[PDB]
């Protein structure tokens, strides 16, 4: 049983959950999220090798509510299952309580749903890591990330993917040097540029406008960038004349 359903192994471990974590790297793409003074930026690689694909339909970022964005690390169908659920939760919350669901509250809620799949035998965990961003009305720029174990926490910044330790250490170093926990830029564009630059650095690769996708949360709304705006960003950081 213990290799197949969410029951304890003699070491008090849950294998299907551990294996669910392995699933999250299967799309072989990295994401990072960073907070500005007044915005939150989420960035994720985009690898569309098959030329028969419509790249504009390939996305692991989702607009959960007017203010909450989500980026997912893991296979797209579990990704879209979660995205649908969070959207529904966020709508129900606003209806019942009369204000917009905070990002950390949505994260906790999804964390709880996730912990339930680790406790009930008949449901499998989702093979996904959900990064939630917003500029919360009370907490300011916010990043909360949930995993298949039902765990979540808030972040100064975070990274998820096969090369996440690389990007993470790239960020920690920067935040040590800087002595603040966010990027001191008001322009969301400068915050996006920052994130692209540090991801390029940590992954040892350059990007064209088709190699990534970008979400941006501000006080007013969360939105994603067209390939055209992404290009404009890539130009801003171009170091060649």
């Amino acid at each position: 049983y213990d290799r197949h359903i969410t029951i304890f192994s003699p070491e008090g471990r849950l294998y299907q959950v551990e294996y669910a974590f392995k699933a999250t790297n299967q799309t072989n793409i990295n994401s990072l999220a960073v907070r500005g003074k007044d915005c939150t930026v989420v960035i994720s690689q985009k690898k569309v090798p098959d030329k028969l694909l419509d790249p504009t339909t390939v996305s692991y970022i989702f607009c959960i509510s007017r203010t909450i964005g989500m980026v997912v690390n893991g296979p797209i169908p579990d990704a879209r299952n979660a995205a649908l659920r969070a959207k529904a939760e966020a709508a129900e919350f606003r209806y019942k309580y009369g204000y917009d669901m905070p990002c950390d509250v949505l994260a906790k809620r999804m964390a709880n749903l996730s912990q339930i799949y680790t406790q009930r035998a008949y449901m499998r965990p989702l093979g996904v890591i959900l990064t939630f961003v917003s500029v919360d009305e009370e907490l300011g720029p916010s990043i909360y990330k949930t995993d298949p174990a039902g765990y979540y926490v808030g972040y100064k910044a975070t990274a998820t993917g096969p090369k996440q330790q690389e990007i993470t250490t790239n960020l920690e170093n920067h935040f040590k040097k800087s002595k603040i926990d966010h990027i001191n830029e008001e322009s969301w564009e400068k915050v996006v540029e920052f994130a692209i630059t540090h991801m390029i650095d940590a992954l040892g690769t350059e990007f064209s406008k088709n190699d990534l996708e970008v979400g941006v949360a501000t006080k007013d709304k969360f939105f994603t960038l067209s390939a055209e705006n992404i290009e404009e960003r890539l130009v801003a950081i171009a170091e060649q004349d």
């Binding site: 607009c63 509510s65 007017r66 649908l84 959207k87 529904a88 709508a91 129900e92 606003r94 209806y95």
Partner: protein, 196 residues
């Protein structure tokens, strides 16, 4: 109540009186009957205040859910959602609702949903106890494709007259303007509209 919504050349304008009564007592003299269910989709409310608030609330929830899943809902779609709730629960609602929206293709749209839950798309719509008194006035003064200013005037004149004759209407005249430029709220006080 006196509520109307009027399509015009650049979009649509919603108007309403601000009086809510229970018996002959004016329980609220500054009611806001112009209710938002999406960015550029709003509605005018008449009938039971509990019913119309409860309906608009649930419709706002449906369109929020719609937006996160499917994208921007059309004015028609909003009218559909209202209709479904009004028709299916006809035996337990008193709601007379005008749905009015802007979009880049149709510009302004107006759907009136009378008691019973039928739905009617119209170039303009009047409703509420006070509208009876202005049927003839509105018929003779409405033109298609009026300017914003001409439209504000039409509504001001219309609702001013309905307020004059209807005990269930009064207070201030509220207006909401839906166009490409966005959402604008207007207000007119008795000392202005009572002289027209």
């Amino acid at each position: 109540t006196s509520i109307m919504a009027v399509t015009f050349k650049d979009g649509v304008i919603l108007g309403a009186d601000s009086r809510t009564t229970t018996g002959a007592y004016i329980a609220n003299r500054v009611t806001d009957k112009l209710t938002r269910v999406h960015d550029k989709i709003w509605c005018c409310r008449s009938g039971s205040a509990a019913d119309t608030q409860a309906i608009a609330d649930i419709v706002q929830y449906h369109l929020e859910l719609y937006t996160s899943q499917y994208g921007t809902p059309s004015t028609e779609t909003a009218a559909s959602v209202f209709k479904e709730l009004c028709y299916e629960n006809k035996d337990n609602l008193t709601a007379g609702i005008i749905v009015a929206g802007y979009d880049d293709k149709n510009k302004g749209e107006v759907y009136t949903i009378p008691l019973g839950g039928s739905v009617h798309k119209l170039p303009y719509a009047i409703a509420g106890s006070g509208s009876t008194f202005i049927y003839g006035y509105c018929d003779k003064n409405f033109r298609e494709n009026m300017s914003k200013e001409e439209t504000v005037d039409f509504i001001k004149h219309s609702l001013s007259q309905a307020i004059k004759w209807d005990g269930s209407s009064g207070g201030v005249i509220r207006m909401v303007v839906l166009t490409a430029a966005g959402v604008e709220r207007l207000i007119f006080y008795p000392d202005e509209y009572e002289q027209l």
